[PDB]
Protein backbone atom coordinates (compact mmCIF):
# COMPACT_ATOMS: atom_id res chain seq x y z
CA UNK A 1 0.00 0.00 0.00
CA UNK A 2 0.93 3.67 0.17
CA UNK A 3 2.71 4.82 3.30
CA UNK A 4 1.37 8.34 3.27
CA UNK A 5 -1.80 9.98 1.96
CA UNK A 6 -1.40 13.51 0.60
CA UNK A 7 -4.24 16.01 0.34
CA UNK A 8 -4.90 16.26 -3.37
CA UNK A 9 -4.46 20.03 -3.35
CA UNK A 10 -0.76 19.44 -2.66
CA UNK A 11 -0.35 18.65 -6.36
CA UNK A 12 -1.22 22.13 -7.60
CA UNK A 13 0.51 24.26 -4.97
CA UNK A 14 2.64 26.72 -7.02
CA UNK A 15 6.31 25.96 -6.22
CA UNK A 16 8.98 28.66 -6.82
CA UNK A 17 12.07 27.43 -8.66
CA UNK A 18 15.39 28.83 -7.46
CA UNK A 19 15.56 30.59 -10.81
CA UNK A 20 12.27 32.46 -10.25
CA UNK A 21 9.75 30.51 -12.32
CA UNK A 22 7.13 28.04 -11.00
CA UNK A 23 6.28 24.35 -11.07
CA UNK A 24 3.86 21.93 -9.39
CA UNK A 25 3.82 18.24 -8.53
CA UNK A 26 1.15 17.67 -11.20
CA UNK A 27 3.74 18.64 -13.80
CA UNK A 28 5.62 15.45 -12.89
CA UNK A 29 2.66 13.12 -13.40
CA UNK A 30 3.57 10.15 -15.58
CA UNK A 31 6.98 9.46 -14.10
CA UNK A 32 8.42 8.62 -10.72
CA UNK A 33 9.29 11.58 -8.52
CA UNK A 34 11.77 11.81 -5.67
CA UNK A 35 10.99 14.84 -3.47
CA UNK A 36 13.66 15.56 -0.89
CA UNK A 37 13.33 18.22 1.79
CA UNK A 38 16.38 19.82 3.40
CA UNK A 39 16.76 22.30 6.26
CA UNK A 40 18.11 25.79 5.61
CA UNK A 41 20.33 25.80 8.69
CA UNK A 42 22.79 23.15 7.38
CA UNK A 43 24.57 24.33 4.25
CA UNK A 44 27.13 21.53 4.22
CA UNK A 45 24.37 18.91 4.48
CA UNK A 46 22.39 20.66 1.70
CA UNK A 47 25.43 20.70 -0.56
CA UNK A 48 26.29 17.07 -0.02
CA UNK A 49 22.78 15.66 -0.34
CA UNK A 50 22.30 17.65 -3.55
CA UNK A 51 25.62 16.62 -5.05
CA UNK A 52 24.93 12.98 -4.25
CA UNK A 53 21.60 13.10 -6.05
CA UNK A 54 23.22 15.07 -8.88
CA UNK A 55 25.85 12.37 -9.42
CA UNK A 56 23.14 9.71 -9.64
CA UNK A 57 20.78 11.74 -11.81
CA UNK A 58 21.48 9.79 -15.03
CA UNK A 59 20.67 6.56 -13.21
CA UNK A 60 17.46 8.06 -11.81
CA UNK A 61 16.54 9.18 -15.31
CA UNK A 62 17.11 5.73 -16.80
CA UNK A 63 14.96 4.21 -14.04
CA UNK A 64 12.16 6.63 -14.97
CA UNK A 65 12.34 9.30 -12.24
CA UNK A 66 12.86 12.97 -11.74
CA UNK A 67 14.17 14.70 -8.59
CA UNK A 68 12.92 17.80 -6.77
CA UNK A 69 14.79 19.35 -3.86
CA UNK A 70 12.71 21.49 -1.51
CA UNK A 71 13.44 23.97 1.24
CA UNK A 72 11.95 27.23 2.48
CA UNK A 73 13.55 30.61 1.88
CA UNK A 74 14.41 32.19 5.23
CA UNK A 75 15.94 35.51 6.23
CA UNK A 76 17.75 33.81 9.14
CA UNK A 77 25.43 30.58 2.96
CA UNK A 78 23.98 30.74 -0.52
CA UNK A 79 26.69 28.13 -1.26
CA UNK A 80 24.32 25.24 -1.68
CA UNK A 81 21.95 27.02 -4.12
CA UNK A 82 24.96 28.22 -6.10
CA UNK A 83 26.22 24.67 -6.74
CA UNK A 84 24.21 24.13 -9.95
CA UNK A 85 22.31 20.89 -9.55
CA UNK A 86 20.87 19.40 -12.73
CA UNK A 87 17.51 18.90 -11.03
CA UNK A 88 15.20 21.66 -9.80
CA UNK A 89 15.38 23.21 -6.35
CA UNK A 90 12.25 24.86 -5.07
CA UNK A 91 11.61 27.41 -2.39
CA UNK A 92 8.45 26.59 -0.50
CA UNK A 93 7.87 30.17 0.58
CA UNK A 94 4.92 29.67 2.93
CA UNK A 95 5.74 26.08 3.95
CA UNK A 96 2.58 24.77 2.24
CA UNK A 97 4.34 21.80 0.63
CA UNK A 98 6.44 21.14 3.75
CA UNK A 99 3.35 21.09 5.93
CA UNK A 100 1.51 18.82 3.51
CA UNK A 101 4.33 16.27 3.94
CA UNK A 102 4.48 17.06 7.68
CA UNK A 103 8.22 17.85 7.69
CA UNK A 104 8.07 21.01 9.86
CA UNK A 105 9.26 20.17 13.37
CA UNK A 106 10.26 21.93 16.56
CA UNK A 107 14.02 22.06 17.23
CA UNK A 108 16.07 23.45 20.12
CA UNK A 109 18.66 25.91 18.82
CA UNK A 110 20.86 27.01 21.73
CA UNK A 111 17.93 27.28 24.11
CA UNK A 112 15.53 28.73 21.58
CA UNK A 113 12.79 26.44 20.29
CA UNK A 114 12.39 27.14 16.58
CA UNK A 115 10.57 25.61 13.64
CA UNK A 116 12.58 23.88 10.98
CA UNK A 117 12.52 21.29 8.27
CA UNK A 118 13.31 17.73 9.28
CA UNK A 119 15.44 16.30 6.45
CA UNK A 120 13.07 13.86 4.71
CA UNK A 121 12.49 12.28 1.32
CA UNK A 122 9.46 10.77 -0.43
CA UNK A 123 9.16 8.53 -3.47
CA UNK A 124 6.02 9.17 -5.55
CA UNK A 125 4.67 6.91 -8.24
CA UNK A 126 3.71 8.19 -11.73
CA UNK A 127 0.13 8.55 -10.40
CA UNK A 128 1.18 10.44 -7.29
CA UNK A 129 1.07 7.71 -4.66
CA UNK A 130 3.65 7.98 -1.89
CA UNK A 131 5.19 4.54 -1.95
CA UNK A 132 8.10 5.11 0.45
CA UNK A 133 9.19 7.77 2.96
CA UNK A 134 12.44 8.54 4.79
CA UNK A 135 12.52 10.93 7.77
CA UNK A 136 15.30 12.58 9.80
CA UNK A 137 17.60 11.37 7.06
CA UNK A 138 21.23 10.55 7.50
CA UNK A 139 22.82 11.92 4.33
CA UNK A 140 25.45 9.23 4.01
CA UNK A 141 24.22 6.60 1.61
CA UNK A 142 20.77 8.20 1.30
CA UNK A 143 20.67 8.99 -2.42
CA UNK A 144 21.87 5.42 -3.11
CA UNK A 145 19.13 4.04 -0.82
CA UNK A 146 16.48 6.08 -2.67
CA UNK A 147 17.74 4.86 -6.05
CA UNK A 148 17.64 1.27 -4.81
CA UNK A 149 14.05 1.78 -3.61
CA UNK A 150 13.03 3.26 -6.97
CA UNK A 151 14.38 0.24 -8.88
CA UNK A 152 12.64 -2.18 -6.47
CA UNK A 153 9.29 -0.46 -7.09
CA UNK A 154 9.62 0.34 -10.79
CA UNK A 155 11.26 -2.97 -11.84
UniProtKB/Swiss-Prot annotation:
SUPFAM superfamilies: Thioredoxin-like. It comes from the Bacteria. Pfam families: AhpC-TSA. Keywords: Antioxidant, Disulfide bond, Oxidoreductase, Peroxidase, Redox-active center. Its EC number is 1.11.1.24. The keyword Lyase does not apply. InterPro entries: AhpC/TSA, Peroxiredoxin_BCP/PrxQ, Thioredoxin-like_sf, Thioredoxin_domain. GO terms for molecular function: thioredoxin peroxidase activity. Disulfide bonds join 46-80. The active site is at 46 (cysteine sulfenic acid (-soh) intermediate). Residues 2-155 form the Thioredoxin domain. It catalyses: a hydroperoxide + [thioredoxin]-dithiol = an alcohol + [thioredoxin]-disulfide + H2O. One of its GO terms (biological process) is cell redox homeostasis. GO terms for cellular component: cytoplasm. Changing residue 46 to A: Abolishes catalytic activity. Thiol-specific peroxidase that catalyzes the reduction of hydrogen peroxide and organic hydroperoxides to water and alcohols, respectively. Plays a role in cell protection against oxidative stress by detoxifying peroxides and as sensor of hydrogen peroxide-mediated signaling events. Belongs to the peroxiredoxin family. BCP/PrxQ subfamily. The active site is a conserved redox-active cysteine residue, the peroxidatic cysteine (C(P)), which makes the nucleophilic attack on the peroxide substrate. The peroxide oxidizes the C(P)-SH to cysteine sulfenic acid (C(P)-SOH), which then reacts with another cysteine residue, the resolving cysteine (C(R)), to form a disulfide bridge. The disulfide is subsequently reduced by an appropriate electron donor to complete the catalytic cycle. In this atypical 2-Cys peroxiredoxin, C(R) is present in the same subunit to form an intramolecular disulfide. Monomer. This is Peroxiredoxin Bcp. It comes from Xanthomonas campestris pv. campestris (strain ATCC 33913 / DSM 3586 / NCPPB 528 / LMG 568 / P 25).
Amino acid sequence: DAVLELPAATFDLPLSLSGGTQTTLRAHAGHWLVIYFYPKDSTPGCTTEGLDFNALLPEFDKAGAKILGVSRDSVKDNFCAKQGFAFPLVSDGDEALCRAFDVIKEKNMYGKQVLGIERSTFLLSPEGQVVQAWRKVKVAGHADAVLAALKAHAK
